[PDB]
Ligand binder design. Structure first.
Ligand SMILES: [Cu+2]
Ligand SMILES: [Cu+2]
Length: 128
């Protein structure tokens, strides 16, 4: 099975998927984030951040507190299972993480922690 997904986020504050399936036979999984807009990361930054569903709100709220210089993530946030960097227009970042961090049955969400953006950029991730 494939073990990677390509995701883009634009200047219009949306991602091109709200649902990712990670096949249980994958040992690692990769997400390739790109930003086809024209606006820079201080104005229209996007990241891809993964946590349990239960943990999403806190990661988003603490990340907003932390500011651009932290990529809008609380330092040392152990709720964050995996994430990309925060990227702007014309940039790309990939993250590859161990599928051993995920369990069949548990409920996960991916999301963008740039202020306001999780209102529209978020989705489920499932191990299947
Ligand atoms: Cu495979
Ligand atoms: Cu964003």
């Amino acid at each position: 099975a494939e073990c990677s997904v390509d995701i883009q986020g634009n200047d219009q504050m949306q991602f091109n998927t709200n649902a990712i399936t990670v096949d249980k036979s994958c040992k690692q999984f990769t997400v390739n984030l790109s930003h086809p807009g024209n606006l820079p990361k201080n104005v229209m930054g996007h990241n891809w951040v993964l946590s349990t569903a239960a943990d999403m709100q806190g990661v988003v709220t603490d990340g907003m507190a932390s500011g651009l210089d932290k990529d809008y993530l609380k330092p040392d946030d152990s709720r964050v299972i995996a994430h990309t960097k925060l990227i702007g227009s014309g940039e790309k970042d990939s993250v590859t993480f161990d599928v051993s961090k995920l369990k069949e049955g548990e409920q996960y969400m991916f999301f963008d922690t740039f202020p306001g953006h999780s209102a529209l950029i978020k989705g489920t991730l499932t191990l299947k």
